Every structure is written in C-alpha cells, then in structure tokens.
Amino acid sequence: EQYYGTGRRKEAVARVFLRPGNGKVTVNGQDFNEYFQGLVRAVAALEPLRAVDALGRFDAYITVRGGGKSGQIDAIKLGIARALVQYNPDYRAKLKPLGFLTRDARVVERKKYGKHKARRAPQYSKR
Amino acid sequence: ARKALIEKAKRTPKFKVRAYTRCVRCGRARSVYRFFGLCRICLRELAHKGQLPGVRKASW
Amino acid sequence: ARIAGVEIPRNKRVDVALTYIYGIGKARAKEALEKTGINPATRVKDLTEAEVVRLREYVENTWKLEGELRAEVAANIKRLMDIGCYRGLRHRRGLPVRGQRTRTNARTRKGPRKTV
Amino acid sequence: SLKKGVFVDDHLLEKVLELNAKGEKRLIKTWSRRSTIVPEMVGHTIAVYNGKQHVPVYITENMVGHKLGEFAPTRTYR
Amino acid sequence: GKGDRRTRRGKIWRGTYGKYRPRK
Amino acid sequence: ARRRRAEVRQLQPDLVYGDVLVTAFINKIMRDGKKNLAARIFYDACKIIQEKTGQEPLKVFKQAVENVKPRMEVRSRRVGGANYQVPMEVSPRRQQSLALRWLVQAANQRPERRAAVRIAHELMDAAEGKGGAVKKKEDVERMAEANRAYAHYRW
Amino acid sequence: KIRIKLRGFDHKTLDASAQKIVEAARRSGAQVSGPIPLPTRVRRFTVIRGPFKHKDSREHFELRTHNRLVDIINPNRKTIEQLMTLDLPTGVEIEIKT
RNA sequence: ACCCCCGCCGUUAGUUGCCAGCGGUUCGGCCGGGCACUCUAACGGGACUGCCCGCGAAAGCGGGAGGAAGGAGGGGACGACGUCUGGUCAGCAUGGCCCUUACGGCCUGGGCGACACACGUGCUACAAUGCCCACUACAAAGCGAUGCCACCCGGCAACGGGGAGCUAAUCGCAAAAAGGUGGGCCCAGUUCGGAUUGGGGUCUGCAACCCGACCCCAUGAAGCCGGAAUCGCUAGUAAUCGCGGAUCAGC
RNA sequence: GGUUAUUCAGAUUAGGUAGUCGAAUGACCUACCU
Ligand SMILES: [Mg+2]
Ligand SMILES: [Mg+2]
Ligand SMILES: [Mg+2]
Ligand SMILES: [Mg+2]
Ligand SMILES: [Mg+2]
Ligand SMILES: [Mg+2]
Ligand SMILES: [Mg+2]
Ligand SMILES: [Mg+2]
Ligand SMILES: [Mg+2]
Ligand SMILES: [Mg+2]
Ligand SMILES: [Mg+2]
Ligand SMILES: [Mg+2]
Ligand SMILES: [Mg+2]
Ligand SMILES: [Mg+2]
Ligand SMILES: [Mg+2]
Ligand SMILES: [Mg+2]
Ligand SMILES: [Zn+2]
C-alpha cells in the first residue's frame, strides 16, 4: 500500500510516507502550499510526481527536520524518488537519467584557521 | 619580577579581583586555560607527550 | 504651526515633525501622541486648530526644550570649565570625553584632517 | 557608579571630621582619587596625588558629585 | 541598522536586548 | 587556468518556463544569494509584461536579450611592445553573459523606484530596439568597427 | 529498575567495559537493555602553535569525553554479585543510580 | 596510502523521534505501546580503470551505463636535505657578561588608553533589491556547581526580588537572522546614517575622573558607493545572514 | 576640463634615486643605482 524512501541533505533529513490519494500533502503539519509560502523552489520538489505523471493522485505525509528552510525541500526531492522507486521498479529506468538519485555532496565546508571563511584571506598587503 | 610574581600569584591575600590565572609549569601570566592551569606552549607540548589524557590530535 | 516659539515643523508627519524640533527626539514625539490621542498618521496641513494648540502648548510647557534647553547644555560645560575637571578640560582642547583614541581618528570632534 | 552608598575612603572622612570637630586647617596629602567628595567638605584643600605629586587643588559647591581625580591632572601638557 | 543605538537588530549585534526587543 | 578548458556551469532550468536562459537572468539579479528575492522581482516584471502588452514575457525576454547581444568587441593585446584594441567575434557564451549582465545594469541606472518595474521598463525597451542597456551594446560595437584597423591580429 | 552510566576517554575501553557488563548481567540475571551511547560531548581547544608570534598555522586537539548507557531491570542476586566482583574498570568513570 | 569530519546502506543498543497503526485527546507524541524509521555514536561493506567504446607498446587519456558517490568525490591532520646568520634569553631552560643595602623586594597612585599627524587590518554606513514595526516558520555546534536561569511582580529599560528544575540528547543561555503576511514611509543630509555631546539611571567589583560595558531621554556629526593604487575568491566557494565558545569579576 | 611650475601626502619599489602617478597651492586657458 504505502510508498517510502529517505531524503537527506545538510543534516536536514526527511522521512517520506505516501499512500495513493487525491493530492493532499501534509508534512510536519501544514498543507504543502501553506508551510512553503512565497518561495519559488518549492514547486520543484514535487517534480518526481510530475515525472511519473501523477500530480493529483498521490497524497503524502513527510516528516522533515533539521537543516535550513530550502535544504529541507531538497531532502524532500529525493525521499519521493526513493518512495516511488521502491514500490515501482519501472519508474527508475527513466527517473534516474533525468537525475534525482544523489545525496548531493554539496555540504557547507569547514572554516580553516588563518582564514576567515575556510578561504577568504585577511586583506593582503606589503606596505 | 618573574619569580617574585609567580609566588605572589599563589598568595591571594587581598580582594579576589587579583587572584589572576597563572600557569602551573611555566608560570606564564597570560593564555592560561582554567580547565588545565596550563599555558598554550606547554599544554601543546604536553599534548604531544600524551601526558594530557583523553586529549587527541584534532582533525575533522 | 509655529510650535516651539520659532521652529515650524509643517507639511510633514505629526510624529516626525516633532523630532526635528530641538529638544524633542523620536520618543518624546510618540509621547505627545498617546497623551493627546492624536493619530500619528495625519499631517500638519490638515489638523484641527484645537490640536494646533492642544498638542503644542502640551509639549511646550511639559518639559525642557528649544534654545533654553541648549542653554543648559551650554551651562553644564561652564561648570566643568571654571574649575578644570578631567571631563571639562576636554572641551577646552576640544578632545573627546570618553577617553577614546586620540592617536587614531576621532575627527568628529577634532575637525577635518589638518596634515601639517 | 555606586548608587547605593557613595564610595570613598574612611581615612578621608576621618582626616576631615577631626577637621570640622574644631574647624582645623585644610592641608592634607591624599592617595585616593578613586573617591567621591563628601558634600560638607567644602572650603578644604585636598592635595591630591596623580602619580606625580600633591596638587593644591581647591574645592567648591559645584564639584561635589565628582571624584578627587577629576580635579587632578594625570598627564603633562593637558 | 547593525549600529543604530535604538533598533530591532540594533541590539542583536551588541549582545543585549533592551526596550526595543521582546524580553521575558 | 592553464590545463583544461574548465567547462561551464550547467545551471538548472526554469521553475516556470523550462528554459535555461530564464534562470540565467535571475542569478545576475540575485544579490547575496537570494534566488527567491530575485525570481519574484523578475516574475513581477513578467506580469507587468502582459499588462502594458498582452504579449508573452517569453518572447519579450527572448527579444530583450537578442537586442543587446553584442556581435564583436575590442580586446587589448600586446605585440612585442604595444597595446592594440583588436576587435573580434565574441564567445557564444560571452554574448549572453554580457547582454544579461548589462541588462541588469540598466535596471539600476533608471529613475524607476521599484526594481521589478525597472527590469519591466527595461526588458521592453530592449525588444523594441532602444534602451539604456541596448546603447551600451551599440557602443561596444562602435569601438569594434572604429579600430577595425588592427583586425590583422585575429589570433 | 537500576541504571548505570559509563563516561570515559578511550572508546576501545568503553566498548569493552560496557560489553562485559552486558554479558554478565544477562547470562546470570533477568533482562538488560544493550549499550546506549549518549551524544559524545567533545571539547575543542585551538591555540597558537608558535611560542612567540604567528597568528596562524596554529594547532588544536579534542577531548573525547565519551558516553555510554546500560539499563538492567531485575535486581537479581546473582547479577549484583557478578557486577560487584567481576568488573574490569580502568579509565572509565561509572555512576550507578536506582 | 593506512587517521578523522561529511557524502550510500546495514549490523548493535533503545527515555531521540511516530494520529505514521489502535485507545484517552486537556485534540499537547501528553499516556499506553514499538524501534521497522528520524536520530544518536560505534563497527563494517562500497569505487578497483571493474565494465562496454575508441587512441595506445605499456603507462594512460577521452566517452557511456550501472551507482549515493568515478579517475585524489569534498574537506582536514600531515608540511622533505635545506634556505632565510629569519623569530623568541619575554613561555621556559641555558654558556658568558652585568646589578647584588639595590638593575633585587612591597604597596599606593600614575602610565601602556598621552595626539598637530601618517600607514596597516576592520565594523557600520551613505540607503527604496531597501529604512521602521506587528505576526509567523526553518539551524549546527557549543558550554552550563560557588554556574546557564524557565515562570510572577515593580519600570521606559538595563536590572533587581521571590522561586521550580539541572553531576547535564530530559532543566536553562534559546526569537537562529535574512526571510513569509500586513503598515506607515516617497528620494529627502532623509523614519537612511549613529558619530558626537548634556542630564538621569542599572550591573561587576576594595575602586569605573583618569580608564568599563549597558540602558532611556535629547543632541541627530562625516558621510551621494569614493584618485593613483590596491585585495579576496573557481562552488556550497564569494558575498550575505545569525549562533556558540575559549579568554574572562566585569569588559 | 587643459597647460605649466613647485611642494609633501600618498602611490608603484625589497629599498633608494628619478620618473611616471596621484593630491594640494600659486600662475594660467619605464631609468639608474645599492
Ligand atoms: Mg535508512
Ligand atoms: Mg558558507
Ligand atoms: Mg581578571
Ligand atoms: Mg537517554
Ligand atoms: Mg501503520
Ligand atoms: Mg513494531
Ligand atoms: Mg580525468
Ligand atoms: Mg603526508
Ligand atoms: Mg637576526
Ligand atoms: Mg595595547
Ligand atoms: Mg540634517
Ligand atoms: Mg555640520
Ligand atoms: Mg560564554
Ligand atoms: Mg614612497
Ligand atoms: Mg620612495
Ligand atoms: Mg599643500
Ligand atoms: Zn607553560
């Protein structure tokens, strides 16, 4: 019945429960359009569902936590691929090449000493 | 006044706004951590000697 | 209208206009409003005459302000002056009174960079 | 700032009370500019130190809430 | 302003809260 | 650098039209990494497109770039000991990059109070033919043909 | 019912000391929940490498003050005799509270 | 290269987490229950030119799939024989020199905080991608026994007084900010800018004049994005946005 | 706005010279060297 996967990025994980339904999408409470308000990136996350051609045909109860606002959405992006790839073998043969299955290694980088931002040196001089 | 001041530090006869931190080995007047009673030099050397238990060459 | 005897904060917010008044800042401005129920929104080109005197006479008589205020400002100095406290001999040479770095800048009280 | 209790040394009040107790002179050599001035101690001459020496600085009714060091220069050419 | 002596984030910068900031 | 060609940043398509170019413009508007602030300000002017003209912002943008896309430019070069302003064909990429760049830079010059309104009045005057940003392209195309002399260093 | 804590620096003598405690309590008494490592609260100390002056190229180490947890239910008579006697502490600071 | 952080998953453990499944619902994971999953550390497998294509003698390079991750995936620890007669007798020890009723020793006060200047590193700004204000939402790490302080009263606030819990994934510093909705603002030396300065206050501490921070009121200075020159950075980087700690009476 | 003269304040130099370069004020319309 249910579809599940595990989205994660920037220590902002996201459980993904999703049983076929109308399209309702509670996630940490709040409707989908309710929590994410005035933020364009949101309409992206639900792309895997648009790849399977089932917008208004899958409800979803996702539990995302930690990390910033947007990073969350990214974890959501993958959790859904995993969710709809688990209970669906034939939906990976096309969803993968379009790219969706990758942790996204792009984590913030540690600040190093003798620098201000792991990299940005103090204003060089000679005088 | 380097000996006569490392000794004066162990005294604390007057008000506590004078019981200023001090090193246990060198008697350095500054850069003395409270957790150790040590200064940055030795505490680095001693840390190489392993004589500071638990401590470990940090590398994240 | 001619509020503090000479200053005339017309054609602008009732709240902000009062700030421009010497001796009256932003807080003392929100002060005359709540104590006279005046809406901060409206202007000075369309206010009742009653308030042109109601709000006016209010602050005028309420607390120190205007040239008389400055006089006190100017007076408190002469005291630090006639005797020579460490705070007073700062207005003399014209240095700062916070004991701040005269070595580097401090121009705001010092004046524009005089190279020489 | 010492709102509670007007800070100052006891030897001051002492070396000046015995002064009011018979209206003695006014000479005095202090080493405590860290002290506020006692209201009634007007007319006296406290020769305040300043790392240098004892300045025969006088006193009045205005200079009360102010400290002793206030009226004792600490640096030359100032 | 990060340095206005009477603002919201004015105190968020100087380590304090003050009047212009919801204390407890 | 010196080794490999160090290839481009293949950005993610548009979250509205599904075309690369559109996203590109966003970025150059984006200050301090605020893709949400910029996207709106661009999308705001998208709808200020169907107002002044029932025309679609898709062609008002496509035509707004291709009307400021400089065709050839003056690059300085040494010649044993001299600095000529050699004119030469721009990179397919360089055109877009500069066009889109200037485009934005116009938005700042204008007297318009609100930003999206600036990029609105600008992206139109672009597809028209005349605009503060279009003139910085007619301008670079000038230095182009004027120095046409030293074209014998095409390299 | 009873609860034991296991702080310590070395982690090889903290998977050992908690591991002996798990085999002795279960093998000679009622149930005993396995080892539950608490979030290792680690200290960090960066300091200037140079004796004199070099505001960089400095060094820094970390204090790995570990954490581990084992909870036993039935206060058996065989177990309390097994724990009291049979135990190999070392650089582990345990604290037991009922 | 074997060392650790973050990148995929599992093994072990269940006071972190689930109206996801059922019962109460005060409709609050609060109670019951459970560890599959989030998390917590700890152990381990995984990527090796292994595979197909093409060049090639080999080494290898270039392209495709599978994969979380391909040609060191990202980062850090690491920095050779030496060089600079580089740095430190002031962290410490050490040869030699030199003082030894004082070049040693103690307090009190002064001074490193002196200002006619000049340079270095920086914060904040000159503003409408924005200034002020009411609501609302999302971090990681870190510390907290003479310390972090929830809740209640006085007040304009800093702060104080009473007082619950905490040898600390369970209590506290704790709204993360920018941002989402709504308001005034309308280009102005400006509701931009907070320097300067008058008066009134709180906290630490024998003591805030010299010489502390921190409130509230007022004063609202220079300052329209900067000459010659010149600096950082190739990707989660620059910029931009908040938090913590060490240091520590406080700063 | 340009020309010229000078000056010190910077700037380019490891440094100096000189110069370039910048600024001020009055008048006016890359080179050498240690
Ligand atoms: Mg999993
Ligand atoms: Mg970053
Ligand atoms: Mg101290
Ligand atoms: Mg627990
Ligand atoms: Mg279920
Ligand atoms: Mg179960
Ligand atoms: Mg390669
Ligand atoms: Mg190595
Ligand atoms: Mg030397
Ligand atoms: Mg200093
Ligand atoms: Mg003004
Ligand atoms: Mg002025
Ligand atoms: Mg702290
Ligand atoms: Mg020079
Ligand atoms: Mg020179
Ligand atoms: Mg001159
Ligand atoms: Zn030491």
Side-chain angles (χ1 to χ4, degrees):
Chain A
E1 164 203 322
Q2 308 185 17
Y3 294 67
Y4 176 89
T6 298
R8 195 189 299 163
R9 201 289 192 92
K10 287 171 187 173
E11 275 185 338
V13 218
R15 293 178 175 181
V16 179
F17 296 95
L18 194 162
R19 323 146 204 166
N22 291 144
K24 205 172 186 178
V25 176
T26 299
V27 173
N28 284 30
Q30 312 309 101
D31 207 331
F32 177 66
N33 301 24
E34 182 79 42
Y35 181 75
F36 309 107
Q37 185 174 348
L39 309 175
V40 186
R41 263 206 187 186
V43 284
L46 285 48
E47 201 66 11
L49 312 182
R50 296 167 170 175
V52 310
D53 313 320
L55 191 164
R57 193 193 83 187
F58 286 86
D59 298 321
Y61 166 75
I62 275 66
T63 299
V64 59
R65 207 71 61 176
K69 166 75 65 168
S70 177
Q72 293 186 160
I73 322 180
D74 303 271
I76 299 177
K77 172 189 174 180
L78 186 275
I80 298 177
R82 286 188 159 176
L84 64 87
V85 75
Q86 214 180 24
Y87 251 91
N88 292 317
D90 283 329
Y91 280 79
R92 187 173 193 171
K94 53 81 71 176
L95 191 59
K96 182 60 176 301
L98 205 287
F100 286 103
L101 303 179
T102 301
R103 243 288 299 219
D104 184 25
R106 291 160 47 168
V107 294
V108 248
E109 192 168 314
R110 172 215 169 185
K111 179 257 179 84
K112 342 276 174 52
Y113 59 163
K115 300 300 169 182
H116 274 272
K117 295 175 62 286
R119 303 188 146 179
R120 179 252 207 254
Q123 248 209 17
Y124 196 109
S125 48
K126 158 271 206 180
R127 269 282 294 177
Chain B
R2 173 210 64 186
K3 186 68 174 176
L5 255 165
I6 53 84
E7 206 65 4
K8 190 194 303 283
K10 281 188 168 192
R11 197 133 38 185
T12 314
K14 307 272 175 154
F15 346 79
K16 62 181 181 182
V17 195
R18 295 195 179 189
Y20 63 79
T21 60
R22 178 72 79 178
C23 193
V24 182
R25 294 198 49 184
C26 59
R28 191 68 193 276
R30 48 175 60 92
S31 269
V32 171
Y33 292 64
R34 313 180 80 136
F35 184 118
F36 277 85
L38 298 183
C39 81
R40 34 183 281 266
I41 330 274
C42 57
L43 120 65
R44 207 179 72 87
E45 309 166 352
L46 295 185
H48 290 217
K49 283 291 183 187
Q51 305 179 11
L52 313 200
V55 192
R56 196 181 192 180
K57 212 295 165 190
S59 59
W60 72 75
Chain C
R2 308 189 52 172
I3 312 303
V6 172
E7 297 180 288
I8 312 176
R10 297 181 180 182
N11 292 322
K12 210 175 183 182
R13 296 275 292 194
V14 297
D15 55 321
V16 181
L18 271 302
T19 311
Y20 287 100
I21 309 301
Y22 192 96
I24 311 301
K26 180 65 191 312
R28 295 192 181 186
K30 304 160 180 163
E31 182 264 20
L33 297 171
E34 307 156 11
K35 273 305 306 303
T36 65
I38 302 297
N39 192 31
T42 49
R43 308 289 171 175
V44 189
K45 75 196 68 172
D46 49 50
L47 85 168
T48 311
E49 322 108 344
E51 286 133 350
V52 178
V53 180
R54 160 202 201 174
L55 200 279
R56 179 206 64 178
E57 214 300 84
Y58 178 41
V59 180
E60 171 176 1
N61 194 31
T62 293
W63 49 35
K64 46 190 176 183
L65 78 163
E66 201 63 7
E68 63 210 11
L69 181 163
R70 222 142 40 195
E72 185 178 3
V73 165
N76 289 287
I77 308 183
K78 326 167 309 178
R79 181 160 51 104
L80 303 172
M81 164 187 294
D82 80 318
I83 187 58
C85 60
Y86 230 94
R87 278 169 40 100
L89 284 175
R90 303 298 296 194
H91 290 68
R92 250 71 292 164
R93 200 170 180 176
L95 298 155
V97 196
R98 257 72 164 176
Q100 315 167 76
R101 312 218 63 81
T102 47
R103 181 157 165 161
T104 8
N105 28 268
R107 262 54 179 92
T108 315
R109 262 201 64 92
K110 300 201 70 172
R113 294 179 184 179
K114 319 92 64 61
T115 301
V116 178
Chain D
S1 295
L2 264 287
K3 68 299 287 183
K4 292 98 59 71
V6 177
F7 65 109
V8 49
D9 274 332
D10 50 309
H11 68 270
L12 264 299
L13 289 61
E14 193 175 353
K15 187 51 185 177
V16 71
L17 282 185
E18 65 149 14
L19 277 271
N20 290 33
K22 200 154 192 168
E24 262 70 308
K25 315 185 317 302
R26 36 67 196 94
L27 189 154
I28 174 62
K29 315 196 303 178
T30 171
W31 280 283
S32 49
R33 56 197 302 118
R34 36 95 77 179
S35 60
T36 312
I37 320 182
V38 176
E40 184 180 336
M41 271 43 269
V42 295
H44 292 289
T45 310
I46 329 86
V48 195
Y49 201 74
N50 46 225
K52 192 69 179 178
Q53 50 178 2
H54 323 262
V55 293
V57 51
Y58 191 69
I59 205 67
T60 196
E61 50 188 356
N62 302 76
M63 39 175 154
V64 177
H66 305 260
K67 322 303 161 63
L68 276 175
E70 287 268 11
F71 307 91
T74 38
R75 299 175 174 99
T76 316
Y77 188 86
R78 283 299 323 274
Chain E
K2 304 157 192 169
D4 277 79
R5 211 181 186 183
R6 304 173 186 181
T7 42
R8 168 75 80 178
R9 301 158 306 149
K11 271 88 167 191
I12 278 49
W13 183 97
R14 310 179 64 180
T16 68
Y17 279 115
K19 168 186 178 178
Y20 304 69
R21 178 72 170 161
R23 205 67 188 271
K24 289 186 174 67
Chain F
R2 261 184 285 266
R3 288 203 176 276
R4 271 47 184 182
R5 194 189 187 187
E7 297 162 16
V8 207
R9 189 152 299 265
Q10 180 54 23
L11 87 179
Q12 179 187 180
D14 184 15
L15 300 185
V16 161
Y17 294 87
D19 187 314
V20 292
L21 176 55
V22 182
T23 41
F25 189 98
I26 308 287
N27 301 320
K28 317 288 280 191
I29 310 294
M30 186 179 63
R31 305 177 179 176
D32 305 17
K34 302 177 56 66
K35 186 186 279 60
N36 280 322
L37 175 47
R40 207 184 91 272
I41 301 176
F42 166 46
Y43 283 109
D44 289 9
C46 270
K47 293 295 190 299
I48 287 298
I49 283 303
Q50 309 177 40
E51 299 283 346
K52 307 277 190 178
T53 175
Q55 276 291 340
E56 51 184 350
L58 181 61
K59 235 50 188 64
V60 184
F61 195 81
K62 261 51 185 58
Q63 192 69 3
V65 157
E66 219 69 325
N67 273 12
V68 186
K69 189 186 184 187
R71 197 148 152 184
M72 265 173 55
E73 64 160 338
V74 291
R75 300 198 60 99
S76 299
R77 179 209 159 179
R78 284 301 176 92
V79 277
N83 272 332
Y84 293 153
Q85 322 296 37
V86 192
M88 46 198 315
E89 285 103 337
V90 247
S91 158
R93 286 168 313 181
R94 174 139 186 102
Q95 295 186 101
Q96 191 177 336
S97 305
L98 282 166
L100 292 169
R101 171 167 297 117
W102 283 304
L103 258 320
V104 187
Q105 301 168 338
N108 294 321
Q109 305 178 10
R110 276 185 156 268
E112 312 276 340
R113 303 203 210 253
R114 292 301 160 187
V117 335
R118 313 193 282 196
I119 305 190
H121 268 136
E122 199 64 47
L123 274 161
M124 290 153 41
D125 297 20
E128 164 186 328
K130 177 171 175 174
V134 198
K135 270 168 184 174
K136 303 186 79 170
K137 162 269 188 181
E138 287 192 25
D139 204 10
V140 173
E141 301 224 26
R142 269 192 193 168
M143 290 295 306
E145 288 302 312
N147 311 37
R148 181 172 167 181
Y150 311 111
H152 55 241
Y153 287 135
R154 334 181 297 263
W155 82 276
Chain G
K1 286 178 158 36
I2 320 307
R3 165 193 300 170
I4 69 183
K5 286 247 196 175
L6 265 67
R7 297 176 305 196
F9 289 156
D10 209 320
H11 91 306
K12 297 160 287 177
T13 82
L14 238 306
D15 209 34
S17 73
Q19 186 192 16
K20 220 288 287 174
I21 286 198
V22 152
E23 305 178 355
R26 285 186 166 268
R27 169 187 49 89
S28 68
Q31 293 183 356
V32 172
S33 78
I36 313 179
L38 305 188
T40 309
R41 309 243 289 186
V42 197
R43 286 280 170 102
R44 289 171 197 164
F45 312 112
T46 78
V47 110
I48 284 302
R49 203 178 288 214
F52 188 39
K53 50 94 188 180
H54 293 282
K55 258 291 156 310
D56 71 339
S57 77
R58 48 176 94 193
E59 202 162 46
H60 50 197
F61 328 90
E62 68 175 18
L63 210 57
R64 297 286 238 191
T65 308
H66 280 49
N67 274 337
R68 280 197 177 281
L69 199 51
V70 146
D71 267 350
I72 68 287
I73 55 170
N74 297 85
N76 317 276
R77 284 296 146 266
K78 184 64 108 290
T79 61
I80 310 294
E81 190 166 10
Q82 191 73 101
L83 296 187
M84 203 64 59
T85 62
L86 198 65
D87 67 314
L88 191 67
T90 163
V92 195
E93 181 72 19
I94 66 283
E95 293 300 335
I96 312 180
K97 306 297 173 182
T98 59

XYZ file of all heavy atoms in Angstrom, chain F residues 49 53 55-69 103 119-134:
254
model
N 4.464 42.590 -17.937
C 4.591 42.424 -19.388
C 3.235 42.273 -20.068
O 2.969 42.906 -21.085
C 5.443 41.191 -19.751
C 6.930 41.488 -19.548
C 5.183 40.766 -21.187
C 7.431 42.678 -20.346
N 1.318 45.185 -22.401
C 1.169 44.495 -23.674
C 0.787 43.031 -23.465
O 1.497 42.281 -22.798
C 2.460 44.577 -24.511
O 2.313 43.787 -25.697
C 3.650 44.068 -23.713
N 1.337 40.739 -24.868
C 2.431 39.881 -25.311
C 3.034 39.068 -24.168
O 3.139 39.543 -23.032
C 3.522 40.711 -25.995
C 3.254 40.999 -27.460
C 3.358 39.760 -28.326
O 3.964 38.763 -27.933
N 2.763 39.815 -29.513
N 3.433 37.840 -24.494
C 4.011 36.908 -23.532
C 5.425 37.306 -23.123
O 6.260 37.599 -23.978
C 4.023 35.497 -24.127
C 4.640 35.428 -25.516
C 4.556 34.044 -26.129
O 4.182 33.094 -25.411
O 4.864 33.910 -27.331
N 5.701 37.309 -21.809
C 7.037 37.619 -21.292
C 8.117 36.702 -21.874
O 9.296 37.040 -21.787
C 6.896 37.371 -19.789
C 5.461 37.576 -19.511
C 4.731 37.089 -20.723
N 7.725 35.567 -22.452
C 8.695 34.623 -23.017
C 9.402 35.194 -24.246
O 10.610 35.009 -24.416
C 8.032 33.279 -23.358
C 8.925 32.168 -23.931
C 10.028 31.775 -22.956
C 8.104 30.945 -24.322
N 8.647 35.884 -25.099
C 9.224 36.497 -26.296
C 9.719 37.925 -26.048
O 10.573 38.437 -26.781
C 8.244 36.450 -27.471
C 8.842 35.789 -28.709
C 9.470 34.435 -28.354
C 10.242 33.830 -29.518
N 11.401 34.671 -29.904
N 9.178 38.558 -25.011
C 9.635 39.876 -24.586
C 10.987 39.758 -23.894
O 11.728 40.730 -23.776
C 8.636 40.537 -23.618
C 9.087 41.952 -23.272
C 7.244 40.555 -24.223
N 11.295 38.558 -23.418
C 12.589 38.293 -22.811
C 13.558 37.802 -23.878
O 14.673 38.307 -23.990
C 12.460 37.265 -21.686
C 13.654 37.209 -20.785
C 13.811 38.134 -19.770
C 14.621 36.233 -20.954
C 14.912 38.089 -18.940
C 15.726 36.181 -20.125
C 15.872 37.110 -19.118
N 13.126 36.822 -24.667
C 13.941 36.308 -25.763
C 14.374 37.432 -26.700
O 15.504 37.447 -27.187
C 13.182 35.237 -26.547
C 13.555 33.819 -26.167
C 13.471 33.615 -24.666
C 13.970 32.235 -24.276
N 15.375 32.011 -24.721
N 13.467 38.370 -26.948
C 13.756 39.502 -27.815
C 14.495 40.610 -27.059
O 15.104 41.489 -27.666
C 12.462 40.043 -28.425
C 12.669 41.034 -29.553
C 13.241 40.386 -30.796
O 13.432 39.172 -30.842
N 13.515 41.196 -31.816
N 14.438 40.564 -25.731
C 15.083 41.580 -24.901
C 16.575 41.322 -24.745
O 17.353 42.234 -24.471
C 14.416 41.658 -23.541
N 16.968 40.069 -24.902
C 18.369 39.712 -24.842
C 18.985 39.862 -26.220
O 20.022 40.503 -26.381
C 18.560 38.268 -24.335
C 19.901 37.707 -24.791
C 18.429 38.219 -22.815
N 18.325 39.288 -27.218
C 18.885 39.244 -28.562
C 18.915 40.622 -29.215
O 19.344 40.763 -30.359
C 18.129 38.241 -29.439
C 19.019 37.433 -30.379
C 19.904 36.437 -29.646
O 20.359 36.741 -28.523
O 20.145 35.342 -30.191
N 18.457 41.636 -28.491
C 18.522 43.003 -28.995
C 19.593 43.844 -28.302
O 19.664 45.059 -28.498
C 17.152 43.685 -28.913
C 16.294 43.419 -30.137
O 16.611 42.554 -30.954
N 15.203 44.165 -30.272
N 20.426 43.193 -27.494
C 21.526 43.868 -26.806
C 22.749 42.959 -26.805
O 23.760 43.253 -26.173
C 21.156 44.242 -25.349
C 22.262 45.063 -24.703
C 19.847 45.012 -25.311
N 22.635 41.851 -27.526
C 23.688 40.843 -27.607
C 24.815 41.277 -28.555
O 24.736 41.022 -29.763
C 23.073 39.521 -28.086
C 23.977 38.300 -28.033
C 23.274 37.102 -28.669
C 24.090 35.823 -28.566
N 23.474 34.706 -29.339
N 21.969 44.170 -19.159
C 20.527 44.200 -18.963
C 20.238 44.655 -17.538
O 19.593 45.684 -17.320
C 19.925 42.812 -19.214
C 19.200 42.532 -20.537
C 18.370 43.735 -20.946
C 20.150 42.145 -21.657
N 13.265 46.526 -14.367
C 13.506 45.420 -15.294
C 12.319 45.212 -16.227
O 12.436 44.582 -17.280
C 13.802 44.101 -14.551
C 14.963 44.285 -13.572
C 14.119 42.979 -15.539
C 15.463 42.986 -12.987
N 11.169 45.734 -15.824
C 9.993 45.694 -16.676
C 10.142 46.710 -17.804
O 10.075 46.356 -18.981
C 8.740 45.970 -15.864
N 10.355 47.971 -17.435
C 10.503 49.051 -18.406
C 11.733 48.809 -19.280
O 11.833 49.329 -20.389
C 10.603 50.414 -17.696
C 9.285 51.116 -17.512
N 8.935 51.740 -16.334
C 8.247 51.308 -18.360
C 7.736 52.283 -16.463
N 7.300 52.042 -17.685
N 12.672 48.020 -18.768
C 13.911 47.755 -19.484
C 13.776 46.620 -20.498
O 14.159 46.772 -21.658
C 15.042 47.444 -18.504
C 16.423 47.595 -19.108
C 16.719 49.024 -19.512
O 16.458 49.936 -18.698
O 17.205 49.239 -20.643
N 13.238 45.486 -20.054
C 13.113 44.303 -20.906
C 12.188 44.547 -22.094
O 12.198 43.788 -23.063
C 12.631 43.094 -20.095
C 13.674 42.248 -19.359
C 13.031 41.417 -18.257
C 14.418 41.351 -20.330
N 11.382 45.602 -22.004
C 10.521 46.031 -23.101
C 11.309 46.877 -24.086
O 11.345 46.600 -25.285
C 9.368 46.875 -22.565
C 8.338 46.118 -21.759
S 7.525 47.213 -20.579
C 7.300 48.690 -21.568
N 11.930 47.924 -23.560
C 12.720 48.841 -24.363
C 13.850 48.087 -25.053
O 14.493 48.601 -25.966
C 13.268 49.967 -23.484
C 12.167 50.816 -22.870
O 11.015 50.339 -22.795
O 12.450 51.963 -22.467
N 14.084 46.859 -24.608
C 15.083 46.005 -25.230
C 14.549 45.387 -26.519
O 15.177 45.489 -27.574
C 15.529 44.922 -24.261
N 13.385 44.751 -26.429
C 12.776 44.083 -27.576
C 12.274 45.096 -28.593
O 12.054 44.765 -29.760
C 11.646 43.175 -27.126
N 12.082 46.329 -28.135
C 11.739 47.437 -29.015
C 12.922 47.752 -29.919
O 12.841 47.624 -31.140
C 11.371 48.670 -28.187
C 11.369 49.975 -28.968
C 11.132 51.185 -28.082
O 10.412 51.051 -27.069
O 11.671 52.269 -28.396
N 14.026 48.161 -29.304
C 15.233 48.471 -30.040
C 16.095 49.488 -29.322
O 17.318 49.481 -29.451
N 15.458 50.370 -28.560
C 16.187 51.411 -27.849
C 16.059 51.262 -26.338
O 14.970 51.022 -25.821
C 15.706 52.796 -28.290
C 16.371 53.942 -27.542
C 16.030 55.290 -28.157
C 16.606 56.427 -27.329
N 16.410 57.750 -27.975
N 17.179 51.412 -25.637
C 17.203 51.330 -24.188
C 18.581 51.648 -23.641
O 19.575 51.499 -24.349
N 18.641 52.084 -22.384
C 19.899 52.445 -21.755
C 20.930 51.332 -21.808
O 22.136 51.591 -21.882
N 20.453 50.088 -21.773
C 21.316 48.907 -21.837
C 21.651 48.516 -23.273
O 22.725 47.984 -23.546
C 20.673 47.733 -21.112
N 20.720 48.767 -24.187
C 20.951 48.484 -25.593
C 22.029 49.407 -26.156
O 22.755 49.028 -27.081
C 19.676 48.670 -26.423
C 19.819 47.962 -27.761
C 18.471 48.152 -25.665
